[PDB]
Amino acid sequence: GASKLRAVLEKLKLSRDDISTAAGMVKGVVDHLLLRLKCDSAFRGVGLLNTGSYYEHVKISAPNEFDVMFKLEVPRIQLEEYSNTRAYYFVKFKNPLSQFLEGEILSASKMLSKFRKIIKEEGSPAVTLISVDITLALESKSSWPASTQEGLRIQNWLSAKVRKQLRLKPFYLVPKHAGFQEETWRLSFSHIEKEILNNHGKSKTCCENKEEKCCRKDCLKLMKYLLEQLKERFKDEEHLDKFSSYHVKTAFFHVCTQNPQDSQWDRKDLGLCFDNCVTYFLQCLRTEKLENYFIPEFNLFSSNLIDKRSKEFLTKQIEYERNNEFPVFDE
Numbered sequence: 390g391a392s393k394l395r396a397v398l399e400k401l402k403l404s405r406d407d408i409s410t411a412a413g414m415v416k417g418v419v420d421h422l423l424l425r426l427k428c429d430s431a432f433r434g435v436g437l438l439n440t441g442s443y444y445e446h447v448k449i450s451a452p453n454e455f456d457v458m459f460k461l462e463v464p465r466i467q468l469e470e471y472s473n474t475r476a477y478y479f480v481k482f483k484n485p486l487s488q489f490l491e492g493e494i495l496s497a498s499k500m501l502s503k504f505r506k507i508i509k510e511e512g513s514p515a516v517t518l519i520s521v522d523i524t525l526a527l528e529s530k531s532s533w534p535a536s537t538q539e540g541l542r543i544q545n546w547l548s549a550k551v552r553k554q555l556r557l558k559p560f561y562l563v564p565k566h567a568g569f570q571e572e573t574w575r576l577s578f579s580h581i582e583k584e585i586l587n588n589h590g591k592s593k594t595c596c597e598n599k600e601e602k603c604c605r606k607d608c609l610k611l612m613k614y615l616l617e618q619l620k621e622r623f624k625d626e627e628h629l630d631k632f633s634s635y636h637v638k639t640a641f642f643h644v645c646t647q648n649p650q651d652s653q654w655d656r657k658d659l660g661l662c663f664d665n666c667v668t669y670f671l672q673c674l675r676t677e678k679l680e681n682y683f684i685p686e687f688n689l690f691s692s693n694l695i696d697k698r699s700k701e702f703l704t705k706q707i708e709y710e711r712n713n714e715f716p717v718f719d720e
């Protein structure tokens with residue numbers, strides 16, 4: 390009964406106990422850069438983004454590297470859509486950050502340079518320094534941009550009441566450049582993704598008692614592990630470098646929308662539920678369409694982002710893994 394999958398989840402768990410002391414190693418360094426960045430005039434309002442502040446690794450199989458976001462409050466921000474890219478925006482103001490202005494557009498590269506220099510004296514999203522990536526993120530308490538109006542389709546799964554509640558929380562903007570226009574900012578909903586993951590069932594008591602243990606989380610871990618295993622095996626063939634755990638997480642949220650009932654995620658159906666996630670992710674690869682869960686018109690599997698041969702290469706390897714009962718999972 391899917392004994393191979395649960396042995397993979399067990400092996401992954403046994404490599405996540407030495408971090409209870411290795412997270413304090415990272416939590417201490419963060420509070421230093423957090424406390425020292427407040428001495429500068431620009432970053433007076435920085436903070437640890439996640440409410441629980443638990444730093445989530447992009448790689449589920451690399452317990453050594455972490456990823457953390459620094460959030461700074463700013464006066465009322467106004468956005469301008471860049472070249473019909475539904476996620477990239479220029480930032481204006483409706484204050485200390487004026488030193489980074491390039492006319493009206495708030496400069497992303499100017500803020501990174503000063504962000505790098507302050508930490509240096511202690512692709513484009515984060516700077517690195519066990520390993521830790523640190524991404525800067527502008528917090529906007531305004532309503533979510535128009536391109537998010539038909540996203541977050543959780544109404545039949547987490548209820549329209551919860552959706553309306555999540556839309557009231559702020560959204561975030563990280564420096565990211567798309568050509569490669571060096572001055573745009575990209576939308577970020579990492580806080581919404583974390584809240585959905587830890588509050589994932591249609592029942593409010595999902596995974597709060599043994600009678601309601603679902604395998605939603607375990608399926609996502611298996612999807613993350615499958616991709617990381619394939620990316621490592623074929624690291625010398627360049628097609629798989631584009632793919633990341635965010636693509637797998639995005640496709641996972643779509644499968645949750647497609648399967649809104651908790652009964653469709655029974656613990657006993659781990660093999661069937663994981664197979665549902667592999668099939669849907671394969672469909673996204675073949676059709677070259679994996680839309681952002683919050684921005685439906687931002688296709689993460691578009692040609693401009695990931696080449697087509699890479700997608701059919703990953704399709705080839707995933708289908709090979711599925712047909713052979715996943716040899717990357719054994720031993």
Ligand SMILES: O=C(CO)N1CCc2[nH]c3c(Cl)c(Cl)cc(-c4cn[nH]c4)c3c2C1
Binds near residue numbers: 512575578694
């Ligand atoms: O490592 C990388 C790639 O550099 N990623 C992991 C972290 C992350 N977070 C993202 C958010 Cl929040 C949004 Cl909106 C979009 C994308 C995105 C993914 N592919 N193209 C855009 C991402 C990514 C991607």
Ligand SMILES: [Zn+2]
Binds near residue numbers: 596601603604
């Ligand atoms: Zn659950």
